[PDB]
Design an enzyme around this catalytic site. Structure first.
Site, PDB file in Angstrom:
ATOM      1  N   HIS A  39       0.786  -1.222   0.000  1.00 34.91           N
ATOM      2  CA  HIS A  39       0.000   0.000   0.000  1.00 34.91           C
ATOM      3  C   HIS A  39       0.826   1.283   0.000  1.00 34.91           C
ATOM      4  CE1 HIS A  39      -3.408  -2.606   0.917  1.00 34.91           C
ATOM      5  NE2 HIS A  39      -2.811  -3.030   2.017  1.00 34.91           N
TER       6      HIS A  39
ATOM      7  N   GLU B 207      -2.903  13.141  -0.180  1.00 33.64           N
ATOM      8  CA  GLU B 207      -4.118  12.760   0.538  1.00 33.64           C
ATOM      9  C   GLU B 207      -4.898  13.999   0.945  1.00 33.64           C
ATOM     10  OE1 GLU B 207      -4.491   8.485   1.941  1.00 33.64           O
ATOM     11  OE2 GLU B 207      -3.611   9.611   3.573  1.00 33.64           O
TER      12      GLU B 207
ATOM     13  N   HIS C 137       3.967  11.221   5.386  1.00 35.74           N
ATOM     14  CA  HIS C 137       3.312  11.093   6.702  1.00 35.74           C
ATOM     15  C   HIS C 137       4.339  10.518   7.668  1.00 35.74           C
ATOM     16  CE1 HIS C 137      -0.992  10.766   4.932  1.00 35.74           C
ATOM     17  NE2 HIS C 137      -0.523  12.014   4.933  1.00 35.74           N
TER      18      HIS C 137
ATOM     19  N   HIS D 160       5.823   7.094   5.800  1.00 38.67           N
ATOM     20  CA  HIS D 160       5.479   6.452   4.526  1.00 38.67           C
ATOM     21  C   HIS D 160       4.971   7.583   3.632  1.00 38.67           C
ATOM     22  CE1 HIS D 160       1.814   6.462   6.936  1.00 38.67           C
ATOM     23  NE2 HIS D 160       1.283   6.833   5.775  1.00 38.67           N
TER      24      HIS D 160
ATOM     25  N   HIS E 247       2.389   8.823   0.036  1.00 41.00           N
ATOM     26  CA  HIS E 247       1.205   8.664  -0.810  1.00 41.00           C
ATOM     27  C   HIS E 247       1.456   9.450  -2.073  1.00 41.00           C
ATOM     28  CE1 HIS E 247      -1.173   7.004   2.551  1.00 41.00           C
ATOM     29  NE2 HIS E 247      -0.505   7.876   3.308  1.00 41.00           N
TER      30      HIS E 247
ATOM     31  N   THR F 281      -5.845   6.992   7.819  1.00 42.20           N
ATOM     32  CA  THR F 281      -6.409   7.084   6.464  1.00 42.20           C
ATOM     33  C   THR F 281      -6.396   5.746   5.755  1.00 42.20           C
ATOM     34  OG1 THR F 281      -4.347   7.767   5.381  1.00 42.20           O
ATOM     35  CG2 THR F 281      -5.804   9.513   6.253  1.00 42.20           C
ATOM     36  N   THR F 282      -6.135   4.655   6.484  1.00 43.54           N
ATOM     37  CA  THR F 282      -6.331   3.293   5.997  1.00 43.54           C
ATOM     38  C   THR F 282      -7.111   2.521   7.047  1.00 43.54           C
ATOM     39  OG1 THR F 282      -4.298   2.309   6.940  1.00 43.54           O
ATOM     40  CG2 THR F 282      -4.179   3.278   4.690  1.00 43.54           C
TER      41      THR F 282
HETATM   42 ZN   LIG Z   1      -0.412   7.926   5.385  1.00 45.78          ZN
END
Ligand SMILES: [Zn+2]
Length: 256
Positions: A61, A99, A112, A87, A89, A193-194
């Site tokens: 992910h 995001e 993040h 991590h 995005h 957010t997951t």
């Molecule tokens: Zn994140």
């Protein structure tokens, strides 16, 4: 697991993802509440030596860097944290993939850095508790120059291109992956957010961006694979309704 965009919605499997106070959100700076109690962020221990190395992993992910003990972050009185991991995005060739958005603007990518409150010894104790976790978020935009700090990570993506693979990278200055302006930011309470989308997370979004070259942004978005034979791209959650939450600003924001 779950998937971005694909599959059926997340609440079918993780009902907390249908909560009322979710992340990410669209930030509208002219409507944020100016809060002079929000002082400059304070970080310590982020300038790591070359050894020991850090684990870097493609989890299907995102790409996630595990941080060592000893990185401290303070949002304010009573709000001290220890960094756990960072991590990213991102989008795809062309398409942006941050995001959070600002007045509906989506930036090329977002970093993040996830932290655990010093009130708790373990992430599992902190999930869902107000303030138990805090994330520092910065937007990545295209600049004309190679960013040397990010190149330490981005040059190691090729070797973890396959889903589930992992490598080790030298210690580096983690704060050089973040903006230099620690005084201007937005802050609100949201969620992971997951899945499992747990609420209570304090989000701090820097106003200043970090600049990567075009080639660097292409490397980030086009190197990794995810589940199946799918490319790991567009790995961002849709923005969520504020539902009456007030986003705070640490500076006079959204004027002209
Ligand atoms: Zn994140």
């Amino acid at each position: 697991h779950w998937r971005y965009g694909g599959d059926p919605p997340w609440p079918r499997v993780s009902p907390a993802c249908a909560g009322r106070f979710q992340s990410p959100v669209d930030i509208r700076p002219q409507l944020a509440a100016f809060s002079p109690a929000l002082r400059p962020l304070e970080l310590s221990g982020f300038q790591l030596p070359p050894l020991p190395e850090l684990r870097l992993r493609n989890n299907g992910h995102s790409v996630q860097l595990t941080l060592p003990p000893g990185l401290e972050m303070k949002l304010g009185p009573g709000r001290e944290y220890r960094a756990l991991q960072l991590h990213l995005h991102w989008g795809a060739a062309g398409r942006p993939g941050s995001e959070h958005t600002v007045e509906g603007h989506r930036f090329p990518a977002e970093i993040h850095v996830v932290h655990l409150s010093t009130k708790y010894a373990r992430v599992d104790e902190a999930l869902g508790r107000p303030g138990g976790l805090a994330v520092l978020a910065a937007f990545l935009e295209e600049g004309p120059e190679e960013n040397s700090a990010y190149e330490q990570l981005l040059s190691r993506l090729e070797e973890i291109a396959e889903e589930g693979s992992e490598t080790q990278v030298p210690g580096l200055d983690i704060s050089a992956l973040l903006p230099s302006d620690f005084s201007r930011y937005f802050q609100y309470e949201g969620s992971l957010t997951t899945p499992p989308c747990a609420q209570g997370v304090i989000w701090t979004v820097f106003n200043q961006t970090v600049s990567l070259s075009a080639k660097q942004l292409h490397t980030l978005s086009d190197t990794l694979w995810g589940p199946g034979d799918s490319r790991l791209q567009l790995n961002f959650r849709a923005t969520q309704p504020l539902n009456g939450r007030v986003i705070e600003a640490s500076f006079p924001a959204g004027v002209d």
